[PDB]
Amino acid sequence: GPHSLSYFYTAVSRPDRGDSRFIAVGYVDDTQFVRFDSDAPNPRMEPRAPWIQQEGQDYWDRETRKQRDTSQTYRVGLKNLRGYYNQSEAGSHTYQSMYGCYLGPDGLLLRGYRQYAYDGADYIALNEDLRSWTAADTAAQITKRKWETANVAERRRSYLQGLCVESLREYLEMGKDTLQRAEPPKTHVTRHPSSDLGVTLRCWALGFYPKEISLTWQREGQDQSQDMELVETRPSGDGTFQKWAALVVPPGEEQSYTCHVQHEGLQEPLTLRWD
C-alpha cells in the first residue's frame, strides 16, 4: 500500500503540579513502534514493536536526546499559548502536533505533513508545498511570523523528504515479516433476537491487518447501509484489528442478505451469509 511513518505529540499543562507532561508515540502504518513519556523516571525513547529492538544503542540514545529536547520545547509552548489566549494558570490545556511522510509507489515522498493544535482546535499547519504555513487565528499568526523569520519551513521539508522516508524504508525492511504481511480477517455471521418482526444478523471480521477494511451488507446485491450498524474499527490487542456490521432482517428471510468483505490481504472480495 502507501506506507507511512508518523509521530503524535501530546503536551498537557498540569496546574496543580506546576509542570507539564509530554507523550510521544511513533507509528509505521497502523503499528505503534516507539513511545516517550516525560513522566517516566530518566525518560527514554522505548520500543513498542519487537522489530525496532534491533536498533543499536546509538539509535536509542539519539531518539532519546530529541524527545527530551522537544519535550521542553513543548513545555514553553504551553506557556506561550496561555499568554496568546488570555488564559489563567487555573486550567489545564492541551497542545498537540502530528507529522509524517507517506511513501509513494516509486519510493518517493507521496505527501508530507506537519500540523499543530491547541485545546482540540487546529492552530497552525505546514502547507502542502512544504514551504509556507497557514495559521488559524490571531495567536497562530504570531507563531507563523516567528517560523517564517527563522526559515523553519525548509527544516520540516528536508526532514520530510529525507530522514523521514529513509527511516521509514529501513523500518519497513526490519519488520517486513509483520509490517509487509497483509493478514486477512477471519469472518463469520451470527444471528440474535431483536424486536417485533426483527432478527439481527452480525457479520464479524476478526484479527486482520492493516486497519483499512470494507464491510457491507446487501439484499439482492443492493447496499443496505441505511439500516445497518457498523462499529468503529477497534484493536485486537495483539496488533490486529476487529470490526462488525449488523442489520435487522425479517424472520425467515436471512438467506436473501449477504455480507461483503474487501481487505488488502484477501485474494478476492469475500461474500458470506448466515450458516
Partner: peptide
C-alpha cells in the same frame, strides 16, 4: 526517526 523540534510556538 523523529524530527528535531527546536523553535518555540
Amino acid at each position: 526517526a523523529a524530527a528535531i523540534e527546536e523553535e518555540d510556538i
